[PDB]
Swiss-Prot record, chains A, D:
Signal peptide limits: none
Subunit structure: Hexamer.
Residues of the full protein shown: 414 to 717 of 719
Region Geranylgeranyl diphosphate synthase, annotated ranges: 1-289
Family of the protein in this entry: In the N-terminal section; belongs to the terpene synthase family. In the C-terminal section; belongs to the FPP/GGPP synthase family.
UniProt key word Iron: no
UniProt-annotated binding residues for dimethylallyl diphosphate: 70, 148-149, 186, 193, 201
Organism this protein belongs to: Phomopsis amygdali
Bridged cysteine pairs (disulfide): none
Residues bound to isopentenyl diphosphate: 22, 25, 54, 71
Keyword list, A-Z: Isoprene biosynthesis, Lyase, Magnesium, Metal-binding, Multifunctional enzyme, Transferase
Protein name as it appears in the record: Fusicoccadiene synthase
Length: 289, 294, 294, 289
């Protein structure tokens, strides 16, 4: 009937939903709801909207990096074919927009529309630097990371500032905290995924090493010419392993995390002092990293 | 520099922005404008957004059906890779959705996006059939063709009408126009099909001819089993493809779509004459659009 | 010398003539003899012909499902090649049909072959489903299982009864016996299935479990799409196979066949008690046959 | 319904039937009906029975020699898979037996049952000599050929002698003509198929050359060791081509045909003189070769 055509379109989403999600986009909102304090009948709807947007982000990601198994279960790219996964991810983002064009928000449609166009620009960069071997710089890797991960919490917050009653004075001093939390969470996720293979999959633990001016040019010319001629040899695979240990990129991630925290605990304090009410939970949210 | 990011993202959509489309969406919009009588500023922004949706559908369709040379240049999938064109298409769809929002919000645009998710339910039906091999019926196949090809004309008309003049009959012509759009989209899909079989796409997709043959009790088993061996071996043969061409030549397949195209053509002709009697004047453009369908 | 031709033809069937079958057709025939009370010359020729049909079905089945090690030796397909085992199987089927003709022709044997062509309509249904991927229903799946596994027991019983004693109730027990055969064959197929899932055959075939899952609206799409990708890539994975095992563990699949096996077991038990009241004495062998079904 | 399960089993047969059959098994019976003169309501049934038996023979053959295209259209082995073609060929022979267990014949069931067991023995030999490289001898190749082709006309005639009224005096002097016509027709078919590739596909035009004691041992050792090590080289493929020309196997087929004819025209004469009625058609049947 109609339920058939409706449950076949939403089948890949129904497969990615049953995954044991970390529950951060649904906890950051629960921690941001301590300050903004929107009604439950609305915060739940916004949580649903950011949840479908993020699950569709995973749907596009798990295909945009060919991986038979993402975590525990097999990857949607490897179960429903590839054409089905793409044609359901696109429908899912449009459905989330229509969910945002509703009670989620009325007049600031351009606000979330632009904050989604940023989310796709910050991803095209990753696909470009992987498909074209064009190694980045930290001034651009941090740009991309904040252009692809933080642009989800940005929509998550820009819709909670459209419902929550002071003024937008917090905005300029609230977005900052959003982008900071987003970058730190991506960095923590990369760290846990590391503790390696290349094949066009950059990270902080690689943009710090491939720019270490000691043995830098050896690196900028080891990946290439080998990634063309097959993939890599066997002593070369150990070479970069021992190279990452040299300057200890794995410790620059620790240092940047030790700076994102002390940047968070001074950025949360801005909100804690703007509104005269502590937040015994958002300070505990930092246990994520 | 954003000047570079904003041009690596748009790069795929720019690659088929200049392809020789020989499209008809433009002619249909310039023919509906003969009735709606909207300012040229409007008929410009509408074409400059429905063309984005169309080219985005091309990226999204001409990639699942991995093709080679298209008009002298290879398919956008093989050049920019699969992962990059998908991201550019998902962005370009949102770019057009944002373009729509700007021109108008009165009379609601929550029914202009609810008319795009239908354009993806249709493609979802098609990509579920071609993948899981489930043969369609005849009514279900017509439903998918209406959902997938005609829905883009439906978006264009539902955006045109929403800023038509604020005069005119308004709603008293809306449902009639929507029926005209459905029949016109169905004809323009079925005509490209009948031109393809004058076949060559037996690698997975489902034309109306295939729906005619697989449903006739004579040789129904044979054709069903041929498609299964094809999808099992990834392409049938140059010999088995000649067998399917001979089934088409046997069951009078090129005579059953013609008897459907020539029927939908007279139906569209009756529909257009019904539009010229609903507080409207002649449209020698629409009757020149039907001539572009053999 | 014919001594060589007559031994290269019989060579494949002789290769599984000594395989450790652990079969049950013999036990069932020796249990039906407890009722029919036929001369041992009969109960010998019957087993020496229904065993030929069974081993021939093995050649014909264990070849389409190209397998490797079977009981410590490879499948008869890989040793003698596909073309040679098929010819030996088609000959051995006719050898058993000719064997049947000899023992008896009164009461007609034109209904003993009409009960073998059913055993091939069943296998034809199975080889059309596994090939063209058409999912079965539940009643159609039970029909195929009755046609394919139970029909060999039906041949044995319709040959036993046709020379049962010329005394006995005769026809007044024929239809009851035929219902007993159908239920017993269905149980012995479903039990081998439930033992296979304590799975490992997701390369094309269709167990009852697969018919339970693909029919439940929850995750019906997921499982259908997994089987399509499997049959498209020729085998799914070691990862996707674990996904199907987790669906089985989720939808309570190993609890729905058990609720069907334990139902068919009580049904068979009631049927056997109904046979002991139809001018017959106890059969402590039949009630020891049911114990060989967990 | 029931028509479904009935038309799926008989679908491969329905595909091999639409082929443009030569129409020999339905013409040999029409030419044998001149002497025996059975009723039409019976000769048609026997023609149907031998037609399904022969179409099932083709079904097993076209799979037992892997060929994507037999003639004009594609091969049943390459359309319905392989498991379907086998499981319909077997059903077709059983159905033909049941058609023979009827009006076709009543009491002489063993006659046609044995004449079908011979038809499968005469084929197992071919599959053995192909699957095992065991080159035959003419004393065995003629045996196999008469054991595989003539055993169809044999059933075609043994059922017309079960309906047709003299005695079985003709039998012993009628079977001979059947087997002679069967061998000559197979030889004519092989000749037309030749006027080559090996891969275990013997013929008269090969059993005559691979036994030509001049260059014989070179042949018995050229095929093997090469058919294992890949297939063949490029000068070797021309070698046997020029070898067949040497002794002219292609002319021993002509000589054996020039003997089968003069053997036929003296075997048909036996029937022509036994019953005092000429046959202006069976003499014209010989135009097949």
């Amino acid at each position: 009937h109609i339920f058939f055509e409706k449950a076949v379109l939403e089948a890949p989403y129904d497969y990615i939903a049953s995954m044991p999600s970390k529950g951060v986009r649904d906890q950051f909102i629960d921690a941001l709801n301590d300050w903004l304090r929107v009604p439950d009948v609305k915060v739940g709807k916004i949580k649903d909207a950011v949840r479908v947007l993020h699950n569709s982000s995973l749907l596009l990601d798990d295909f945009q990096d060919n991986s038979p198994l993402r975590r525990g279960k097999p990857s949607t790219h490897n179960i429903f074919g590839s054409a089905q996964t793409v044609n359901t991810a696109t429908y899912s983002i449009i459905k989330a927009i229509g969910q945002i064009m509703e009670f989620s928000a009325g007049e600031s449609v351009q606000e979330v529309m632009n904050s989604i166009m940023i989310l796709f620009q910050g991803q095209a960069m990753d696909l470009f630097w992987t498909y074209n071997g064009h190694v980045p710089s930290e001034e651009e890797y941090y740009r991309m990371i904040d252009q692809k991960t933080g642009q989800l919490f940005s929509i998550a917050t820009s819709l909670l500032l459209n419902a929550a009653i002071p003024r937008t004075k917090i905005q300029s001093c609230l977005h900052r905290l959003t982008r900071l939390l987003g970058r730190c969470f991506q960095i923590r996720d990369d760290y846990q995924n590391l503790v390696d293979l290349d094949e066009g999959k950059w990270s902080l633990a690689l943009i710090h090493m491939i720019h270490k001016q000691r043995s830098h040019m050896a690196l900028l010319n080891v990946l290439s010419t080998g990634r063309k001629h097959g993939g890599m040899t066997l002593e070369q695979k150990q070479f970069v392993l021992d190279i990452i240990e040299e300057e200890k990129s794995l410790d620059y991630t620790r240092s940047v995390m030790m700076d994102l925290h002390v940047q968070l605990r001074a950025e949360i304090g801005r909100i804690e002092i703007l509104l005269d009410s502590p937040n015994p939970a958002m300070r505990l949210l930092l246990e994520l990293l």
